[PDB]
Design an enzyme around this catalytic site. Structure first.
Site, PDB file in Angstrom:
ATOM      1  N   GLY A  42       0.816  -1.198   0.000  1.00 35.41           N
ATOM      2  CA  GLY A  42       0.000   0.000   0.000  1.00 35.41           C
ATOM      3  C   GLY A  42       0.851   1.249   0.000  1.00 35.41           C
ATOM      4  O   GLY A  42       2.078   1.206   0.124  1.00 35.41           O
ATOM      5  N   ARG A  43       0.169   2.386  -0.121  1.00 36.61           N
ATOM      6  CA  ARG A  43       0.833   3.678  -0.191  1.00 36.61           C
ATOM      7  C   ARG A  43      -0.110   4.745   0.328  1.00 36.61           C
ATOM      8  O   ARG A  43      -1.330   4.648   0.159  1.00 36.61           O
ATOM      9  CB  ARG A  43       1.260   3.990  -1.625  1.00 36.61           C
ATOM     10  CG  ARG A  43       1.674   5.429  -1.890  1.00 36.61           C
ATOM     11  CD  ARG A  43       2.134   5.548  -3.340  1.00 36.61           C
ATOM     12  NE  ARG A  43       2.742   6.837  -3.649  1.00 36.61           N
ATOM     13  CZ  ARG A  43       3.509   7.065  -4.712  1.00 36.61           C
ATOM     14  NH1 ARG A  43       3.789   6.077  -5.568  1.00 36.61           N
ATOM     15  NH2 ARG A  43       4.008   8.281  -4.916  1.00 36.61           N
ATOM     16  N   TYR A  46       2.188   9.862   3.161  1.00 37.16           N
ATOM     17  CA  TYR A  46       3.415  10.010   3.934  1.00 37.16           C
ATOM     18  C   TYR A  46       4.304   8.780   3.909  1.00 37.16           C
ATOM     19  O   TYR A  46       5.383   8.811   4.514  1.00 37.16           O
ATOM     20  CB  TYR A  46       3.089  10.352   5.401  1.00 37.16           C
ATOM     21  CG  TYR A  46       2.218  11.571   5.615  1.00 37.16           C
ATOM     22  CD1 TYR A  46       2.701  12.843   5.351  1.00 37.16           C
ATOM     23  CD2 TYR A  46       0.915  11.446   6.102  1.00 37.16           C
ATOM     24  CE1 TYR A  46       1.913  13.966   5.556  1.00 37.16           C
ATOM     25  CE2 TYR A  46       0.117  12.563   6.313  1.00 37.16           C
ATOM     26  CZ  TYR A  46       0.625  13.814   6.032  1.00 37.16           C
ATOM     27  OH  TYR A  46      -0.158  14.923   6.233  1.00 37.16           O
ATOM     28  N   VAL A  49       4.278   1.011   2.050  1.00 37.45           N
ATOM     29  CA  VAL A  49       4.332  -0.168   2.890  1.00 37.45           C
ATOM     30  C   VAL A  49       4.628  -1.386   2.034  1.00 37.45           C
ATOM     31  O   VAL A  49       3.967  -1.613   1.013  1.00 37.45           O
ATOM     32  CB  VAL A  49       3.011  -0.329   3.658  1.00 37.45           C
ATOM     33  CG1 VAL A  49       3.089  -1.527   4.571  1.00 37.45           C
ATOM     34  CG2 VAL A  49       2.702   0.945   4.443  1.00 37.45           C
ATOM     35  N   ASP A 152      -7.227   7.886  13.986  1.00 36.99           N
ATOM     36  CA  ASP A 152      -7.497   7.386  12.650  1.00 36.99           C
ATOM     37  C   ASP A 152      -8.037   5.964  12.718  1.00 36.99           C
ATOM     38  O   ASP A 152      -7.677   5.091  11.919  1.00 36.99           O
ATOM     39  CB  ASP A 152      -6.280   7.514  11.746  1.00 36.99           C
ATOM     40  CG  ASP A 152      -6.602   7.400  10.282  1.00 36.99           C
ATOM     41  OD1 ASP A 152      -7.753   7.625   9.845  1.00 36.99           O
ATOM     42  OD2 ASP A 152      -5.635   7.094   9.533  1.00 36.99           O
TER      43      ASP A 152
HETATM   44  O1  LIG Z   1       1.650   1.201  10.820  1.00 36.30           O
HETATM   45  C1  LIG Z   1       1.294   1.608   9.480  1.00 36.30           C
HETATM   46  C2  LIG Z   1       1.230   0.333   8.760  1.00 36.30           C
HETATM   47  C3  LIG Z   1       0.806   0.394   7.319  1.00 36.30           C
HETATM   48  N1  LIG Z   1       0.292  -0.849   6.766  1.00 36.30           N
HETATM   49  N2  LIG Z   1      -0.449  -0.756   5.627  1.00 36.30           N
HETATM   50  N3  LIG Z   1      -0.850  -1.938   5.266  1.00 36.30           N
HETATM   51  C4  LIG Z   1      -0.385  -2.845   6.188  1.00 36.30           C
HETATM   52  C5  LIG Z   1      -0.564  -4.229   6.238  1.00 36.30           C
HETATM   53 BR1  LIG Z   1      -1.613  -5.127   4.948  1.00 36.30          BR
HETATM   54  C6  LIG Z   1       0.006  -4.920   7.272  1.00 36.30           C
HETATM   55 BR2  LIG Z   1      -0.253  -6.805   7.376  1.00 36.30          BR
HETATM   56  C7  LIG Z   1       0.729  -4.246   8.252  1.00 36.30           C
HETATM   57 BR3  LIG Z   1       1.496  -5.228   9.666  1.00 36.30          BR
HETATM   58  C8  LIG Z   1       0.927  -2.877   8.200  1.00 36.30           C
HETATM   59 BR4  LIG Z   1       2.008  -2.112   9.555  1.00 36.30          BR
HETATM   60  C9  LIG Z   1       0.355  -2.157   7.158  1.00 36.30           C
HETATM   61  N1  LIG Z   2      -3.383   3.327   6.795  1.00 29.69           N
HETATM   62  C1  LIG Z   2      -2.757   2.058   6.411  1.00 29.69           C
HETATM   63  C2  LIG Z   2      -3.713   1.274   5.536  1.00 29.69           C
HETATM   64  C3  LIG Z   2      -3.201  -0.075   5.101  1.00 29.69           C
HETATM   65  C4  LIG Z   2      -2.299  -0.181   4.059  1.00 29.69           C
HETATM   66  C5  LIG Z   2      -1.833  -1.406   3.626  1.00 29.69           C
HETATM   67  C6  LIG Z   2      -2.301  -2.555   4.226  1.00 29.69           C
HETATM   68 CL1  LIG Z   2      -1.742  -4.093   3.671  1.00 29.69          CL
HETATM   69  C7  LIG Z   2      -3.213  -2.466   5.260  1.00 29.69           C
HETATM   70 CL2  LIG Z   2      -3.819  -3.879   6.054  1.00 29.69          CL
HETATM   71  C8  LIG Z   2      -3.674  -1.235   5.683  1.00 29.69           C
END
Ligand SMILES: OCCCn1nnc2c(Br)c(Br)c(Br)c(Br)c21
Ligand SMILES: NCCc1ccc(Cl)c(Cl)c1
Ligand SMILES: NCCc1ccc(Cl)c(Cl)c1
Ligand SMILES: [Cl-]
Ligand SMILES: [Cl-]
Ligand code: NA
Ligand code: NA
Length: 328
Positions: A42-43, A46, A49, A152
């Protein structure tokens, strides 16, 4: 002297200044070269990930690479995560690392195998909702007890591995320390999860903001309307709330706290009765709704942030008795 939290109000004042003075925090930045990125997850504005492997020990992790510009916000998130170390159902920060050449920082988190609840074999039962809501409340009670508002709370920030029954509250990038009488930026939370206090520009909010967001999630899960309050913009978001909670009741809240209402709202709020929660029940959701679910919801989705249940009070509600009993 407008408003303060009913719980945990002075807890940061009672701690060492270093606990909450995140601008003074000096992280220890380890070496990002130990991690191999596998796939993008994801993105955001800021950060981005990735799923990754620690090549020194084969551990699967999540790496959040931070756009390095705003150093104060990085320190805030790092210090908050360090303060929350070991908290129940809070995502575990394993390390803080930098690319040793560019110095771009990143956060390394425990991996969680996140279930897509749109694509399920059997979909959530009444007990499942009670169970996961209880687990989420443990995380919120913990962070609130640690003097921190998440700001959030929303489905996408609650990772659930439905196979292993593990829940983690993620994305602490908007989280802040609560200090009595402090005025906070209302530009926090996702639209659908913003409390009325944010929508009316009331800055003296507290942990109870997260309990509104929680309530929005509870409503969406028991009634199967996701999101529950579906605004088209921040103005319409308050209209969606008022169509349920009532307009006279909104005005009573504003009066109590001496809140000025942006006059654009006068042209869009209309006049709305407070609705009975039972109005949302129909054949597709009846199996998820009970008197105890509605009583809990009614005590979370209140305009008056002070009168909402705390995370602990919510955990103590009869709705969760079957969960507590099974956990014993
Ligand atoms: O703390 C910000 C984290 C951002 N972020 N976005 N997608 C996420 C997923 Br999907 C996993 Br599974 C985990 Br773990 C994290 Br951590 C993730
Ligand atoms: N605000 C973070 C949102 C997020 C982004 C990527 C993933 Cl994989 C998850 Cl679970 C959740
Ligand atoms: N991404 C999972 C969001 C979610 C779904 C169901 C429940 Cl009951 C909860 Cl707490 C949270
Ligand atoms: Cl703020
Ligand atoms: Cl409605
Ligand atoms: Na954890
Ligand atoms: Na506004």
């Amino acid at each position: 002297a407008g408003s303060r939290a009913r719980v945990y109000a002075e807890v940061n004042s009672l701690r060492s200044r270093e606990y909450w003075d995140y601008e003074a925090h000096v992280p220890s930045w380890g070496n990002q070269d130990d991690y191999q990125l596998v796939r993008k997850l994801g993105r955001g504005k800021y950060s981005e990930v990735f799923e990754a492997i620690n090549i020194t020990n084969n551990e699967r992790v999540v790496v959040k690479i931070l756009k390095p510009v705003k150093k104060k916000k990085i320190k805030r998130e790092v210090k908050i995560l360090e303060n929350l170390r070991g908290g129940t159902n809070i995502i575990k920060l394993i390390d803080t690392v930098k690319d040793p050449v560019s110095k771009t920082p990143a956060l390394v988190f425990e991996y969680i195998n996140n279930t897509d609840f749109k694509q399920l074999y059997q979909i959530l039962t009444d007990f499942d909702i009670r169970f996961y809501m209880y687990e989420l409340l443990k995380a919120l009670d913990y962070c609130h007890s640690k003097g921190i508002m998440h700001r959030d709370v929303k489905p996408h920030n609650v990772m659930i591995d439905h196979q292993q029954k593990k829940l983690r509250l993620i994305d602490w990038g908007l989280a802040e320390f609560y200090h009595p009488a402090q005025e906070y930026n209302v530009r926090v939370a996702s639209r659908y999860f913003k409390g009325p206090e944010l929508l009316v520009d009331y800055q003296m909010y507290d942990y109870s903001l997260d309990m509104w967001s929680l309530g929005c999630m509870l409503a969406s899960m028991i009634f199967r309307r996701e999101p529950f309050f579906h605004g088209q913009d921040n103005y319409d978001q308050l209209v969606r709330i008022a169509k349920v909670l009532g307009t006279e009741e909104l005005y009573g809240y504003l009066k109590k706290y001496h809140i000025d209402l942006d006059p654009h709202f006068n042209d869009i709020l209309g006049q709305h009765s407070r609705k009975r929660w039972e109005n949302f029940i129909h054949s597709e959701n009846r199996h998820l709704v009970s008197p105890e679910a509605l009583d809990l919801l009614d005590k979370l989705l209140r305009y008056d942030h002070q009168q909402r249940l705390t995370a602990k009070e919510a955990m103590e509600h009869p709705y969760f008795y079957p969960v507590v009993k099974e956990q014993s």
